[model samples]
Target: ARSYQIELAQPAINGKNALICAPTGSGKTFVSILICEHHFQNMPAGRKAKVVFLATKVPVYEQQKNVFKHHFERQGYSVQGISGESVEKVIEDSDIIVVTPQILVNSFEDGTLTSLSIFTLMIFDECHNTTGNHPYNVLMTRYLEQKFNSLPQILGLTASVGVGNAKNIEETIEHICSLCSYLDIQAISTVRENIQELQRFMNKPEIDVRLVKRRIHNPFAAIISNLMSETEALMRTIYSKDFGTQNYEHWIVVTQRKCRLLDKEEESRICRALFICTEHLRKYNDALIISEDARIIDALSYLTEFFTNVKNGPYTELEQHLTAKFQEKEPELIALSKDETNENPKLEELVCILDDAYRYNPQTRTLLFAKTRALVSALKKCMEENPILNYIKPGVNRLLIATSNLVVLYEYSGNVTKMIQVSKCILVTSKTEVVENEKCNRYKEEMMNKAVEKIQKWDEETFAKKIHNLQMKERVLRD
Candidate 1:
């Protein structure tokens, strides 16, 4: 049985850094724990080994901790999950440390956790994020720099190596390799001999695309068009492109940021206009979503709630005009949303599918996917209201909601359950957005100062000397 597992562990066992790309249920975690155990057991004399497993999400942190504990703890290894809430010192005693990189990186920099030399194996879970300015890449970059000293073997695990929106295979490979460059390894996949076995881990699933027809007449488009024109005229800025596109959104964001940099007296009016326009555009996006794929009632309800909140804030002319225009169309929008003929066609189809499934098998479980959070909420509401769908219990499932492009091969023989909204439990505060906070600013200065000091002292000769010294140290350890 262990021989069956050896094929997947070959790359790591061979003392090479690896990027393991396998299917969802292909036992990537199993291979990682196996490699960790082997590395710990085979260490040379006068040195100790520890495994640091980094998870990108907190939920994953707990999941990995449980899995690793189940497998390793009974095998005589002490496994611990370290998070922001957990004490940083836990790593000193833990044989296998499962952690979030954000928490670990802060500890590493702040001197709480001094070095990576103690960890003989550093495994990055969901290593596809090891590119760009993500924390995973930052940690790996630092680790590679220290590779000239004592450093651990690297192992990256992921279900997919994304194409990075590349146009062709060559570009996709280049992007993937660049990500793998941090780990200093080429990507690997199961060979022909194991391809059949890999296929058995996943059920052959079918995909059905439902196309809904466009509305014959949309009054919201007209209202939005006139308001946008009026706002543009008031602002006296001619955008050389179309509205309701990514570029337009980017432009508005850039303009608002640039305005903040200008002299207060010169920028006040323009900044005010930009603010109003941005808020209006945001509502426009919300309205567009509801009009196209959601119930019109949802859109009207949102607009009513929005205007009510706006009234309590600083009242601007643009806000006033927006309120007036939206109110003018409120009755018509409400009536249209209530009309059965104008109901979302996709929901109609979804209801029918569920009804047939329930009639045939009362214990059917459905996993619905939506492109946006707004649509997810709208669908959940629609499902909860239908009498036929009332048989299904509604609840939030964190694991499935937290990830995308997911696959489940196991069948659930239970009561039908409707998926509520995808939990926005993951708090993603952007560095740029948080820079205005005093603590963030302080942290930024500290990081910048550290970087400056390092750069000032670093030179070609000094760099070369460090490398030479590290080589000698590595030789002693090897010998």
Candidate 2:
């Protein structure tokens, strides 16, 4: 066996208590693997049991176990998953069982596990989720009190500390280490050694590079324009607004007020009504900021309150903003068109965008960016039942691109994950992310223009040319 990196060397060093933290896609996996390998190699020649690695997911746990299983099994090591139907038997019978958190928690209570006594090493993957009184934290505490004197030790690994600060991470390590004997021994030495090694490693070399690309043909641009005209006479209203005077306040306020109301299911119908009016404004006045007026806020709030209880809420006004008729609701939103056309222009614009999205470029995806999460879902429903794309099943062709929480945690349950680090992925961002450039509390009015000037230092034409070069390279590779 090779020597342990100074950060983690012998079971004797940590007694082995350790917590590994770094950015995603970094070598945290290798760190844990190296630690486990060091222990297995250093085990006394007559040791009766080996290491165990418990991950957080069945698929991930089993897939990872295969790495050690293939490489070390011929040397008398064994690794198999404790999952599905075999979880009980595996927990009681196996020397090296890799299991998900849910399975392991269940195994701890299983009657079959009572007599089990084996030298064990528990590897916690995605260890950030173990915070506070969470189930995993509780489980770890239980194991520590009961199994602390075991041979191998617990190894926790995560891409993030949940809180990135050094102090919080150090506290978390000490908290977990307090439950076991091994980790308490070398905590300070491991910490100092790792930090110095990492800092020196960072100062070795540095370089800066960037890739820029833009599509000359924006597919959605024409579709959006045509839809606006058909639904609400918007082209003229947008051209009239001075872009320089667009205030960032309007965007953030609209987002905080309306966006939150839309995401809650109890607030769905009012949100449904608000989305109709917002769509009306989008079609007629692309430059219009809908949340600026007090009357509109009061009207929408009342409409939402009405839908929450009133069974016979007036349909006539609801249909106006929802459809094309503006008279019934008396909406404070800007006139879909100053022309007062009787036709359903708002719905017409929506249908046109959906039609073009599904028909014109089947390969391209359409994203209807909205200020509210509730509104986004409403748009998604309409897109699915759209005149042109209705044939595509909800899961088949079209999908709504939204936040990591919405997509990974709530909407698709982690199956539809797309790496946020990838630029090709379409992101519908709002003022919530960085706070619009206008709300610069850090700078005075005079300094604000300086910030704007700094932003303009990059030449657009050069950026476009560089992007074209990268895209050309991508095209050649694909061919």
By TM-score, the best candidate is 1
TM-score of every model? 0.53, 0.43
Q: Which regions of candidate 2 fall more than 4 Å away from where they truly are?
A: 1-15, 74-76, 85-95, 131-135, 147-151, 162-324, 327-419, 422-479
List, residue by residue over 100-147, the lDDT tens digit for candidate 2: 666556666764443233545666677656645554665554554454
Model 1 C-alpha lDDT per residue in residues 131-193, reported as the tens digit of each score: 667788778767766765557788998866565655544454445545555565532533334
Off by over 4 Å in 1: 1-6, 86-89, 112-114, 186-192, 220-479
- Model 2 clash pairs are 17-183, 212-467, 213-467, 231-345, 234-284, 317-328, 320-325
Error of 1 at 260 (Å): 27
Instruction: State model 1's lDDT.
Output: 0.62
What's model 1's lDDT at 123? Answer: 92
Backbone clashes in each candidate structure, one number apiece?
0, 7
Residue pairs in clash, model 1: none
